[PDB]
Design a protein around this ligand. Structure first.
Ligand SMILES: Cc1cc2nc3c(=O)[nH]c(=O)nc-3n(C[C@H](O)[C@H](O)[C@H](O)COP(=O)(O)OP(=O)(O)OC[C@H]3O[C@@H](n4cnc5c(N)ncnc54)[C@H](O)[C@@H]3O)c2cc1C
Ligand SMILES: Cc1cc2nc3c(=O)[nH]c(=O)nc-3n(C[C@H](O)[C@H](O)[C@H](O)COP(=O)(O)OP(=O)(O)OC[C@H]3O[C@@H](n4cnc5c(N)ncnc54)[C@H](O)[C@@H]3O)c2cc1C
Ligand SMILES: Nc1ncnc2c1ncn2[C@@H]1O[C@H](COP(=O)(O)OP(=O)(O)OP(=O)(O)O)[C@@H](O)[C@H]1O
Ligand SMILES: Nc1ncnc2c1ncn2[C@@H]1O[C@H](COP(=O)(O)OP(=O)(O)OP(=O)(O)O)[C@@H](O)[C@H]1O
Ligand SMILES: COC(=O)c1ccccc1CS(=O)(=O)NC(=O)Nc1nc(OC)cc(OC)n1
Ligand SMILES: COC(=O)c1ccccc1CS(=O)(=O)NC(=O)Nc1nc(OC)cc(OC)n1
Ligand SMILES: Cc1ncc(C[n+]2csc(CCOP(=O)(O)OP(=O)(O)O)c2C)c(N)n1
Ligand SMILES: Cc1ncc(C[n+]2csc(CCOP(=O)(O)OP(=O)(O)O)c2C)c(N)n1
Ligand SMILES: [Mg+2]
Ligand SMILES: [Mg+2]
Ligand SMILES: [Mg+2]
Lengths: 607, 255, 604, 245, 49
């Protein structure tokens, strides 16, 4: 062989190599759960001073904790579990990180290579199982390949669009001792294509940048459709501000794009999509040019694809507008919507390579007229509190938003999945990048608490708040004790409506209030938190809301806060069915009262 | 349900006795022909009257000449004649010495008892209408010599009332039988290394070049189809040298 | 031959009708935005009961506890995306233990498939490696056919999990055409006239088997879970064991199939099986495998597995006979001498006539009873002023539960508590021990207990769980209250991951690497979920607590503080054969107790 | 980098030079033309005949390019194919001159009919090349030029035995390809020569003998010319749609 | 492509398919007027020498 040969690992076992590889890959923390087939590795990382360790009560926690670590630190989340049941429990975090583009390197144990395909004890086709929900996976056949595969794993998990990779580690491989020099430098097949077509591709993207700037300067009603792609670079958000200030372009963001733009800015369109504000939705529909930056046109965002962006589409047929897409992967170009100008590569890099081609603009009176009109005509409206009424969910978010902000701390917000997830995205003011961590692509319940723990590990002195739902919290509440053991002072907020809100909303609207198994039996969260070793606070009456929120944030250490919110409240606005973004269903104080009395009639007063 | 039935042929097998009885019965006869014919090769100077002078000599001495062909070499004023004779060695050698003594000849070589490549050319027109039609066609031209009518009616009516006579066959079946006969003749001449140079509605012309014993067998196999017209050359030859391996020629046991 | 009784119904409504047709009376599931058309149809359905867990993994584990305790398929109705990927582990668990299960997962509309849709996962591509057969229903016309295929496959041959993906548009669609419901299985279409030649082959295999059994002088019945998949299983096993006087050893999943209060009982085989059974196997001239697949946890070192059986096979006087339902597991691990394909129970009846009745096996049982009275399940018992021993808790509860007169079903987690609940508990009844053996999933005890309680509402379902395992899925503690299941949760709290620590104390110089999790207040936890919490940490307090625990009228949790760092013995690990076990010795444990304190600095 | 490859750079014609080539190469006649006539004699196989027809044609100074007596498969019936050249009225005199002979049934004129004329040729042809052939001819022609011939590069002398072996088979292949194209065959292969066989038109026979001539022809023998008329058939649509009447 | 092709004609092939079709369809003696019709055909092997 002709490549370089390393002798630093000669004499070390497979497990002891793994310990070194973590320091060679700059790993601060490893989330995992010990097991039989992975014992040689755990024996080698025993009291290791190369990285800390977080022990969950369930492997699904380890995965979700690793995701929270990656979303907050920007570093690959490492998971070290065992074979069989330990490897099948990290499938959901992998599938979740595969859709939201979160860098993970999952290390699963495996039965000895001499037992593969013998229906062995705790044996599973982990590679086959995770094949569709991972960016790439491999089973290390020998100790010689071990450092090579690890480097391949970390590179793939961070190259292009970040994602999860799985490295299957047989016991006999991690237990055996390396005795020969080995290759270490990676040679990915994808890099062989880029090396051959380097000059041709780098000029092709520049040509697209030229055509992009020409179309941008030509636009008169432009809209920056910003996604999670701009957050995968340190200089991401700042170049977004620069582009938005230079040409006076309004900025709307996806759910995973929140935080990439200061929402205190007059050019902030806030969130768009299914439960996005009408201002952003109408702006997208009426814009003549859509500049998609780091987004993939999700079906929760575009709504009806046929009715998506009528003005921007017809402007393309006149050569005065269209859609510009800044993507890192050609896979997501011309997949959902047809694009007139495609700019391949890192969005932040290309934006900083287009600044010298964008004509400065100071005023768009006609275009910002409709935007500011929509902001006043279509705000985030809801049935606010009345004297002698149950606490409203939207209000809690608004109050916690200013309370957490008036601490001077760096606040990181994680959520579950449901009505509380949307309300936390709507009524929270996002200014800082990597401060909102939620499961949007796959929408995994029980994501709130473990992601909060993992994010807390990445940012120890940061205020990490978990805005969770009662049903979501009842998925992985076992990790409460794990938070104590990990020493993470996470802040848990449970908007308890004693129901599966998001599902009941669809049942109330599309299934004539026929609530089928959407009301689970919640436990006493206060007694639960204390049983786990945390502080428990409950708010029933409306008056105690402010006083408890201050105590909830001021509390040193992990604390759980339950807020009994009003039930059967639909998240509005809403774009569902065959409705376009301009065909949203807005809030109506009379309709909610009508639906309330109708609900009591059909449910027999039960709801 | 039963498997689709098949009438088993069950081809009978030989036993040791009937097999030997067959081989012994199918034995020919040794020396059914006399002494092998002799082939002479004349090297004659090409001057006017040589063909009349040579062939005239053999006729003036009553030599039983089977064939005589004069071949033009690629040398100016030089021709080659290949002669085939029958008789004892003493008579034929005299014939050689009688021709060689002539003025316009260089030398007359004896190719008998020598390894040579005997060749002959034949071109024959073969009927495609079949056997019945050939009987009709041949008997028709015979009445132009026999001068008979009422007596020949017994024959021609018997022929034309046969099953596979074209007159009793539909126009579509005669067409197939023409090409079936054509394919048979073509396969027959191809095995002999010949060619089909002409194809018509009613006949075809075959061309073959080989040794006389090969062509005669060919013309016997094509005969049943009906040879309408034939042109068969004499016989020319070119000497061959029998190659033997260095191990075989090393056997010089002349002790 | 076209069905037309579903015309006008929606896919979800057809699903509801198919459940009654498949005699389904219980469904474990969790709603979602893609399975809504189905849930709207089964709303207040009087055709079957519904059990709502707090996690989909719970539903899968509840379905297994239901399946193994009833013999009926466990039906799972979850949504797409995360709802489907959360049932992967119990599917892989059921795929290993061979548990009948039909998992219906939701799916995004067919118009959005292949567009990285919202909550879309390749559930077919994922569950393919851990299911007998899966399918994505392409149209409502195919839905009654696919469901019929699912239940049939899940219960044919060796039982197992099947997955049926239900697209949103499919379940919402209204059927407007006559449909085929008749299954067209390829492996079943092979039986045209091959059934005869195969039926003769198995019968001649019975003849050769019956002859070899009568010739055997030291035979051993190696019994697994395959004998439990038939009602007359345990019945026919006893009939043969009495007829030919053949001793019976069972696997972990074979427990309950044979009376352990019978003199011919050999107790459990394998890694943590008693020496009596292991030595019996290693010294047997003929091994009769009935419903077992020779797992690596059972055979130990495959090179040394039953030398006397192989030697007898080479001399034509014994060997290994294998009763297996699927030829896949025949000659996969060990080379059998006689193979009896098909249902083990069914074939045992056909062979029973050709077996010569044996009066007594004197010198064989004399050697067995010698081992049996020389290698008990010895362990360091309690001393005045000592901590509560885990093995003792299993002992006492095995009698307390027996004194109730109630049908007792026992479910366990995974670890030391699992093995001790299998060794020291006396098994006499079939389908009363439900544990995760093939895959060994932690957090299996509580949900399987809830599921089994649904299957047998009269039975006393006791969950012998561990502290680390209980932390995996203790969220379903609240599900037990809502399901109305008065399950009994027993936690052997050693405040550690005993099964891993044991391997670290034996093979890794007492280096405990992250094997000590922080347990919650199990008693405060239980009452927060809606149960009653009981705790015992004193010897003279245990017996009274074990009775209050069992006699509690409803869901209840009892935490028993047990002694730490106590290895499960005997233990056949490494390259050691079944006869090369590691037995208990009071001095050996007393020494390592002193060695551990020095190496751990008095911490452990 | 650059993987080097020599550019042949094949030149192309223009409209002018292309015409200039065609005009230059196209065939042309010569002074005092000549055409071929073919006769077919049906004679009785009596003693003589061959001397009679040949004598009658020689005693009148006819051209006579070939005679060729062919045997019909009929008892006592021969057939001759006489090739002539001259004016149409001159060769007609020859036809009536032979037909008058008493054993001659008839003499048919095939010069104005579609016929198949074939000629057999058997050549030996050396494999050793031109240089050896010049040596062999001069050897039998019974100095200084002998030395110059044997000092040529591709003579068998001053040339390795291996290259001679390959040049033998190289020539053998080149001859074989010629015989194949003309529809002939190689019937014999020795260590120094290869006897070939060909049956075709005399105008094609001479063409083959001219092409294989440089290889050096040792022996040769041309039969003459055998003629058999094609069975009358050429057109399908002009059979009755001639309207010449 | 690799295909095994019969040489017994269409009649036998039409017979061959019916035999293997009634071996998977039903065990009853159905399609009696089909096997009897395919057979006794002019160019079925069973009717030729
Ligand atoms: C109950 C619920 C409701 C929801 N409703 C909404 C809603 O109303 N509005 C909404 O917006 N979301 C909503 N979602 C989430 C939604 O389903 C998607 O997850 C969301 O659209 C994802 O945001 P994104 O596409 O911008 O980011 P991603 O899904 O992560 O897509 C990133 C894209 O940018 C590209 N990219 C990645 N990195 C880079 C880079 N460095 N440079 C260039 N390109 C890069 C990638 O190739 C990819 O195509 C909801 C989720 C849930 C659970
Ligand atoms: C920590 C731990 C330790 C363990 N240690 C042990 C141990 O020491 N000893 C032990 O025995 N187990 C042990 N196990 C379990 C072990 O891993 C296997 O699960 C166990 O061997 C399974 O038992 P089984 O093979 O008999 O049943 P199964 O694994 O279910 O196999 C049944 C076999 O019988 C066949 N079969 C099924 N149904 C029928 C039928 N109706 N008719 C005929 N054949 C049929 C099946 O095809 C299959 O081949 C342990 C598990 C754990 C988690
Ligand atoms: N009835 C026919 N009319 C015309 N051509 C025919 C006929 N039958 C056969 N042929 C073709 O003529 C070919 C024979 O011609 P050949 O190859 O010998 O060239 P040729 O000797 O130069 O003939 P010609 O001098 O007439 O051009 C046959 O191989 C065959 O392809
Ligand atoms: N030097 C050779 N000696 C013998 N046979 C040869 C030699 N060279 C070639 N052959 C073979 O002889 C074959 C000639 O076959 P041909 O049809 O002429 O046999 P033939 O007419 O019966 O003549 P003969 O009686 O000499 O064998 C060549 O095709 C070739 O396969
Ligand atoms: C997990 O075992 C394997 O991966 C395996 C599977 C098949 C064949 C061989 C092995 C390796 S092993 O037999 O030596 N067992 C092992 O390494 N660890 C080990 N740890 C236990 O407690 C956590 C319990 C336990 O089985 C009861 N096995
Ligand atoms: C789950 O939706 C789909 O499977 C899906 C995926 C891609 C494209 C289309 C659909 C169907 S849908 O847009 O009409 N949504 C739906 O049926 N249910 C639905 N329920 C919600 O609450 C539980 C929330 C929610 O997304 C926010 N969608
Ligand atoms: C594991 C999983 N199962 C099902 C779903 C579908 N689902 C989405 S939201 C929801 C109900 C949760 O509501 P909740 O968590 O209490 O938040 P809420 O809407 O009530 O505020 C469900 C079942 C999911 N996202 N994940
Ligand atoms: C999901 C999962 N992770 C890891 C393992 C490996 N494992 C087997 S037993 C065990 C420790 C559990 O000990 P415990 O449940 O408390 O029972 P104990 O042996 O301590 O009595 C572990 C981690 C497993 N079987 N399943
Ligand atoms: Mg809720
Ligand atoms: Mg424990
Ligand atoms: Mg021609």
């Amino acid at each position: 062989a002709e490549p370089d040969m390393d002798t630093s690992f000669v004499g070390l076992t497979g497990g002891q190599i793994f310990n070194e590889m973590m320091s060679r890959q700059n790993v601060d923390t490893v989330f995992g759960y010990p097991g039989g087939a992975i014992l040689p590795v755990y024996d080698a990382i025993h009291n290791s001073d190369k990285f800390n360790f977080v022990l969950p009560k369930h492997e699904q926690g380890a995965g979700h904790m690793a995701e929270g670590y990656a979303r907050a630190s920007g570093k690959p989340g490492v998971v070290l579990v065992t074979s069989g049941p330990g490897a099948t429990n990290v499938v959901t975090p992998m599938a979740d990180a595969f859709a939201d583009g979160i860098p993970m390197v999952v290390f699963t144990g495996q039965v000895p290579t001499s037992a593969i395909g013998t229906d062995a004890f705790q044996e599973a086709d982990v590679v086959g199982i995770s094949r569709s929900c991972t960016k790439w996976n491999v089973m290390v056949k020998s100790v010689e390949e071990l450092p090579l595969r690890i480097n391949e794993a970390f590179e793939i998990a961070t190259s292009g669009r970040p994602g999860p990779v799985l490295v299957d580690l047989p016991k006999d491989v991690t237990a055996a001792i390396l005795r020969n020099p080995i290759p270490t430098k990676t040679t990915l097949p994808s890099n062989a294509l880029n090396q051959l077509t380097s000059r041709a591709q780098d000029e092709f993207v520049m040509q697209s940048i030229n055509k992009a700037a020409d179309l941008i300067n030509l636009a008169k009603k432009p809209v920056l459709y910003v996604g999670a792609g701009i957050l995968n670079h340190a200089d991401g958000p700042r170049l977004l501000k620069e582009l938005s200030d230079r040409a006076q372009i309004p900025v709307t963001t996806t759910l995973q794009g929140l935080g990439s733009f200061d929402q205190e800015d007059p050019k902030s369109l806030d969130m768009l999509g299914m439960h996005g504000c009408a201002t952003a939705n109408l702006a997208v529909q009426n814009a003549d040019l859509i500049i998609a930056v780091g987004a993939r046109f999700d079906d929760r965002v575009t709504g009806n694809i046929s009715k998506f962006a009528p003005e921007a589409r017809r402007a393309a047929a006149e050569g005065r507008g269209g859609i510009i897409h800044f993507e890192v992967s050609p896979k997501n170009i011309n997949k959902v919507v047809q694009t007139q100008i495609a700019v391949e590569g890192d969005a932040t890099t290309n934006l900083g390579k287009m600044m010298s081609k964008i004509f400065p603009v100071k005023e768009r009176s006609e275009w910002f007229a409709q935007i500011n009109k929509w902001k006043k005509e279509y705000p985030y409206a809801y049935m606010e509190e009345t004297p002698g009424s149950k606490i409203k969910p939207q209000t809690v978010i608004k109050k916690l938003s200013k309370v957490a902000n008036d601490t001077g701390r760096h606040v990181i917000v994680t959520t579950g999945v449901g009505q509380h997830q949307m309300w936390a995205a709507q009524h929270w003011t996002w200014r800082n990048p990597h401060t909102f961590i939620t499961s949007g692509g796959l929408g995994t319940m029980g994501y709130g608490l473990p992601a909060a723990i993992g994010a807390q590990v990445a940012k120890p002195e940061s205020l990490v708040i978990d805005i969770d739902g009662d049903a979501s919290f009842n998925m992985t509440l076992t990790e409460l004790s794990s938070a104590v053991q990990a020493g993470t002072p996470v802040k848990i907020l449970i908007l308890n409506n004693e129901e599966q809100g998001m599902v009941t909303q669809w049942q109330s609207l599309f299934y004539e209030h026929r609530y089928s198994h959407t009301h689970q039996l919640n436990p006493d969260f206060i007694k639960l938190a204390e049983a786990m070793g945390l502080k428990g606070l409950r708010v029933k009456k409306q008056e105690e809301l402010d006083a408890k929120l201050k105590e909830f944030v001021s509390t040193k250490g992990p604390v759980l806060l339950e807020v009994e919110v009003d039930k059967k409240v639909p998240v509005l606005p809403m774009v569902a069915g065959g409705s376009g973004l301009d065909e949203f269903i807005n809030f109506d104080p009379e309709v909610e009262r009508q639906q309330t009395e109708l609900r009591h009639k059909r449910t027999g007063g039960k709801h | 349900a039963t498997r689709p039935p098949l009438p088993t042929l069950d081809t009978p097998s030989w036993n040791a006795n009937s097999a030997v009885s067959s081989i012994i019965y199918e034995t020919p006869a040794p020396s059914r022909q006399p002494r092998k014919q002799h082939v002479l090769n004349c090297l004659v100077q090409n001057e006017p009257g040589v063909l009349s002078r040579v062939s005239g000599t053999l006729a003036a001495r009553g030599f039983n000449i089977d064939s005589l062909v004069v071949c033009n070499t690629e040398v100016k004023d030089l021709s080659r004649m290949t002669i085939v004779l029958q008789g004892q060695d003493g008579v034929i050698e005299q014939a050689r010495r009688q021709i060689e003594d002539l003025v316009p000849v260089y030398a007359v070589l004896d190719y008998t008892n020598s390894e040579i490549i005997k060749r002959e050319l034949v071109m024959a027109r073969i009927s495609l209408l079949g056997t019945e039609y050939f009987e009709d066609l041949l008997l028709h031209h015979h009445t132009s010599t026999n001068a008979g009518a009422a007596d020949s009616q017994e024959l021609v009516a018997e022929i034309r009332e046969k099953q596979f006579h074209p007159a009793n066959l539909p126009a579509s079946e005669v067409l197939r039988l023409k090409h079936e006969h054509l394919n048979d003749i073509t396969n027959l001449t191809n095995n002999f290394g010949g060619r089909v140079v002409d194809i018509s509605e009613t006949s075809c012309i075959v061309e073959l070049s080989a040794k006389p014993t090969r062509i005669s067998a060919f013309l016997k196999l094509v005969e049943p189809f009906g040879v309408l017209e034939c042109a068969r050359s004499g016989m020319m030859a070119l000497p061959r040298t029998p190659l033997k391996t260095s191990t075989e020629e090393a056997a010089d046991e002349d002790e």
